[PDB]
Amino acid sequence: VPAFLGNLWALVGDPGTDHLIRWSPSGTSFLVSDQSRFAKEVLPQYFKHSNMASFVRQLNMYGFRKVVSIEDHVEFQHPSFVRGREQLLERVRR
Amino acid sequence: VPAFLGNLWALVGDPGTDHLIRWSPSGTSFLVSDQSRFAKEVLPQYFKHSNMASFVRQLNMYGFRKVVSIEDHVEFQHPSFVRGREQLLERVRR
Amino acid sequence: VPAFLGNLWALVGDPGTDHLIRWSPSGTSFLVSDQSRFAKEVLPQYFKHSNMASFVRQLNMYGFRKVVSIEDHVEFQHPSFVRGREQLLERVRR
Amino acid sequence: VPAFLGNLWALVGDPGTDHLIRWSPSGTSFLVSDQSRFAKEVLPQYFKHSNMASFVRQLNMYGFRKVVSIEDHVEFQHPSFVRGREQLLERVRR
Ligand code: NA
Ligand code: NA
Ligand code: NA
Ligand code: NA
Ligand code: NA
Ligand code: NA
Numbered sequence: 574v575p576a577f578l579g580n581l582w583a584l585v586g587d588p589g590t591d592h593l594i595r596w597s598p599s600g601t602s603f604l605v606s607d608q609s610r611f612a613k614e615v616l617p618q619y620f621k622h623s624n625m626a627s628f629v630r631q632l633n634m635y636g637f638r639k640v641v642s643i644e645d646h647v648e649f650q651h652p653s654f655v656r657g658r659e660q661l662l663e664r665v666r667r
Numbered sequence: 668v669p670a671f672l673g674n675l676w677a678l679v680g681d682p683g684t685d686h687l688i689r690w691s692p693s694g695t696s697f698l699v700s701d702q703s704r705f706a707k708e709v710l711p712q713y714f715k716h717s718n719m720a721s722f723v724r725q726l727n728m729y730g731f732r733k734v735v736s737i738e739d740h741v742e743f744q745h746p747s748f749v750r751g752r753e754q755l756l757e758r759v760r761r
Numbered sequence: 762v763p764a765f766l767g768n769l770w771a772l773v774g775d776p777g778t779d780h781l782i783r784w785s786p787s788g789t790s791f792l793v794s795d796q797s798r799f800a801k802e803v804l805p806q807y808f809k810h811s812n813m814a815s816f817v818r819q820l821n822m823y824g825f826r827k828v829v830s831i832e833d834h835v836e837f838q839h840p841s842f843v844r845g846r847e848q849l850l851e852r853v854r855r
Numbered sequence: 856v857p858a859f860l861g862n863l864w865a866l867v868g869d870p871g872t873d874h875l876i877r878w879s880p881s882g883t884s885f886l887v888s889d890q891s892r893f894a895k896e897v898l899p900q901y902f903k904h905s906n907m908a909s910f911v912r913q914l915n916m917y918g919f920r921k922v923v924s925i926e927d928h929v930e931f932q933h934p935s936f937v938r939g940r941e942q943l944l945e946r947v948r949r
């Protein structure tokens with residue numbers, strides 16, 4: 574598992590960051606609920622920058638997508654990034 | 668499980684429809700690979716009409732979302748609609 | 762996926778065999794609820810023998826285990842044989 | 856979620872206890888790798904007693920089963936106790 578993904582897995586699932594980034598209820602996507610606080614408070618700790626565009630570009634490079642309504646709270650999804658599915662994470666690729 | 672969801676589960680999971688509507692590799696979302704052909708050919712088999720707008724409105728009413736690139740086919744997701752998670756399907760609500 | 766496992770996956774999940782072999786409610790194990798009928802009616806169709814000991818030996822060769830009470834209905838489990846987890850099935854090995 | 860199950864979920868999932876109690880690779884069962892040391896060392900941390908018999912009786916009362924070879928460590932399973940399946944845990948009942 575690439576370091577970025579291992580750090581992302583830990584970060585999403587950590588209860589100490591859930592006020593800003595957390596799994597969805599079923600774990601098949603994850604939410605960043607306050608992008609500005611996330612980029613200033615959380616991204617420094619785990620990725621040593623504060624640039625939300627940069628983090629998003631790295632998600633894009635691993636194939637993550639965005640979840641939006643059919644008709645701030647941003648929601649990301651990757652088919653192989655699912656809470657608890659540790660072995661499935663090995664299928665995320667650049 | 669409301670009949671809409673049971674029908675949708677069967678439609679998505681049916682190998683015979685996978686050329687037009689299928690689970691994602693991990694089963695946490697589903698893909699419609701061509702909306703016009705899907706509505707004409709496969710929608711009636713399971714839903715007995717051919718109106719894509721009606722179908723998508725129902726998805727919206729059950730809380731489905733779309734999955735789009737971070738930056739014709741469509742991908743839909745619901746936290747409680749996951750391949751194999753039959754009991755979880757009981758949590759999808761209007 | 763080895764043919765035996767592909768056939769086993771299809772067999773367990775098939776609604777037309779659920780009266781004799783079926784997934785548990787959450788799909789993390791599966792049950793054979795009438796071993797004699799299963800071996801006489803189901804195993805011929807899918808594995809061209811009627812020998813429950815043989816089928817069990819093949820499960821044992823792929824690392825399947827039995828689920829029993831802490832203190833007929835036989836229940837089998839393999840960590841990588843889970844309803845809906847199609848990609849995980851690729852990790853079952855002899 | 857009853858306190859027993861919340862404590863068990865935390866105990867199993869804690870990396871700091873994985874040398875004695877851990878999820879299986881796929882998370883559909885959990886393993887206790889040495890019962891005597893587990894009861895003396897790690898059980899009190901999460902349950903505040905050191906009585907393996909009491910703990911196993913509680914597992915039985917919540918419907919947990921053992922996973923054994925088809926033919927000292929122990930492996931326990933419950934259809935509704937699955938790594939990452941937080942909502943499913945609400946289905947475990949006394
Ligand atoms: Na978190
Ligand atoms: Na999981
Ligand atoms: Na299909
Ligand atoms: Na599943
Ligand atoms: Na079946
Ligand atoms: Na699944």
Ligand code: NA
Pocket residue numbers: 866867868869870871872873874876877878
């Ligand atoms: Na642990």
Ligand code: NA
Pocket residue numbers: 600655656657658938939940
């Ligand atoms: Na999960």
